[PDB]
């Protein structure tokens, strides 16, 4: 289950019981899809009518295949921003090449690979002058084919985002093509039973890029996240301004510590990015390429905030800011100066009118929290 505790001195919330799922490295698997099977093609031309019209695709992406190779690649001369943004230099190995493994990769007989060779290794998956460039249609007896409606999307995914696909599609890496490709990942059998059961939260977290087109086949690279540490004790702090002391002045304070922390090693690694941490149920998916580390003498900061022991990361002011801050379970409220704050339910809009100070309200106690005329609705959702 999930627990939360409120610290009246720091006016902050600390929510515990999240089992962290942490990304460590990346499994890179290269699918290069060839054209086929076009082998059900008639022998004869006509300017009669159906389809093809997947030509403009094999151009449109071949077009921007140079755009990245020019506007980016040549012109090259916080997670995940840099990470896959940098992990392109995995492709500078893959592309700007000859085939490398290309044909010798899959060959016969498997569509799979054991290892991709290279300056480094990789997966190789797959499916399907005087070249094509074919022009025709003829009406004889028509069936579903010449759209496997699989590649056709791959471009609109690649082109609309300019070669870098923000997440892994169903048709970019097939459900079982992604499932099996999990089975080969370098950690354990523990994270597998999860990463398979969690599969969608991989794809949201993935990156993908186009190795090549040519005419030969369309070669793209799917990078996947891999989580090394499956179940770990991680927890999240939420803060609001703790102000005090009215003789007609105000002495105020704020925690700068939030919101996330986890410790695998253990060493306690803290995740300051508003992004980089996401919740599904109990589990918390965080990006290990974020940081930093701090000591396990961080812990103290919760208990006495004024500790000479490990001076805590805070903020001072004679300036109070009346504001609201939401928790995984309840919500914190700080009403200061001349302002007016209250709560409410779905069946009554104003139930209690809150004191001026820091005050904590669980989701049994209220739903609405009215701030001076912005309503915060009390979520089940975290920071």
């Amino acid at each position, epitope marked *: 289950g999930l627990k939360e505790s409120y610290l009246e001195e720091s006016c902050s919330t600390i929510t515990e019981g999240y089992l962290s799922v942490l990304r460590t490295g990346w499994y890179t698997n290269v699918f290069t899809l060839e054209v086929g099977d076009v082998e059900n093609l008639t022998c004869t031309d006509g300017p009669s009518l159906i389809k093809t019209e997947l030509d403009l695709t094999k151009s449109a992406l071949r077009e921007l295949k140079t755009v990245s190779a020019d506007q980016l690649a040549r012109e090259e001369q916080t997670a995940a921003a840099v990470t896959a943004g940098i992990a392109i230099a995995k492709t500078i190995r893959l592309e700007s090449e000859v085939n490398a493994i290309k044909g010798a990769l899959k060959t016969t007989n498997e569509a799979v690979s054991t290892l991709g060779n290279g300056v480094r290794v990789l997966a190789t998956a797959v499916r399907e002058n005087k070249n094509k460039c074919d022009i025709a249609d003829l009406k004889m007896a028509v069936s579903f084919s010449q759209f496997n409606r699989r590649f056709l999307n791959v471009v609109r995914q690649f082109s609309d985002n300019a070669g870098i696909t923000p997440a892994i599609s169903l048709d970019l890496m097939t459900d079982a093509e992604l499932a099996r490709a999990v089975s080969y990942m370098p950690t354990s059998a523990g994270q597998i039973k999860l990463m398979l059961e969690n599969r969608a939260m991989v794809r949201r977290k993935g990156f993908g890029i186009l190795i090549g087109v040519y005419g030969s086949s369309v070669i793209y690279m799917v990078q996947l996240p891999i989580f090394g540490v499956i179940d770990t004790p991680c*927890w999240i702090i939420k803060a609001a301004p703790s102000c005090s002391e009215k003789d007609g002045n105000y002495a105020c304070l704020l925690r700068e510590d939030q919101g996330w*922390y986890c410790k695998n090693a253990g060493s306690t690694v803290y995740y300051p990015n508003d992004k980089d941490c996401e919740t599904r149920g109990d589990h918390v998916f965080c990006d290990t390429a974020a940081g930093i580390n701090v000591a396990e003498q961080s812990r103290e900061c919760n*208990i006495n905030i004024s*500790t000479t022991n490990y001076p805590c990361k805070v903020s001072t002011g004679r300036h109070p800011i009346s504001m609201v801050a939401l928790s995984p379970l309840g919500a914190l409220v700080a009403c200061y100066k001349g302002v007016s704050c209250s709560i409410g339910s779905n069946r009554v809009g104003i139930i209690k009118q809150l004191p001026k100070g820091c005050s904590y309200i669980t989701n*049994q106690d209220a739903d609405t929290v009215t701030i001076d005329n912005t309503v915060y609705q009390l979520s089940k959702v975290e920071g």
Partner: antibody
Amino acid sequence: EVQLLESGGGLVQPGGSRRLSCAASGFTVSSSYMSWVRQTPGKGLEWISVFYSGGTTYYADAVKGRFSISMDTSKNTLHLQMNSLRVEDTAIYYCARVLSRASGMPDAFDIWGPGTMVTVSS
Amino acid sequence: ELALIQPASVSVSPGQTASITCSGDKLGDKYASWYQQKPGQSPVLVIYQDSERPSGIPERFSGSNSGNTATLTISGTQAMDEADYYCQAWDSSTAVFGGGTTLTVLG
């Protein structure tokens, strides 16, 4: 093997003062969160204080400005000094360790020790 | 605020599982613990974070805590289990027990 022993109070006359001790074997003290829990014989348990190992300390309402909870951290002893002692305070006094969980927050009482009766009486 | 409250009396038929409730304020979902103390003994810790038994405690024990209320459940119910049982949790930064629950194993 990990265990605690509390150093007796005995008998203290009301308006009293006295000072207990717990010293433990098998673990440090400033290492861990620890606290004092008293029980008047036949009745139920009452937490009377806790020591957070940063030096920071909280007391149960029923004794405040009376009891002070300390550490030698040399003899590896834990002290509870009791003042202006009153009849109601008569009880066993257990010392027991408080687990650290994962973050800083306190969790459970893992091990105790037999505890040593104060009787407060004139 | 916190004060816990648990019933001072419980009975059980031998071998038939039975169990005791400790409920206060918001245990939702607050970290519990569970103590067994036979007469004249120090009390020993039967279950802590919750429904989690520490090393070398019989697994016929286990906990449940959700919402208002936490409940300690004994599957086997052998007469050696007859005792006082206490539960505790944390608040502000300070602890709380409530002292109620003896058991019985009849007849």
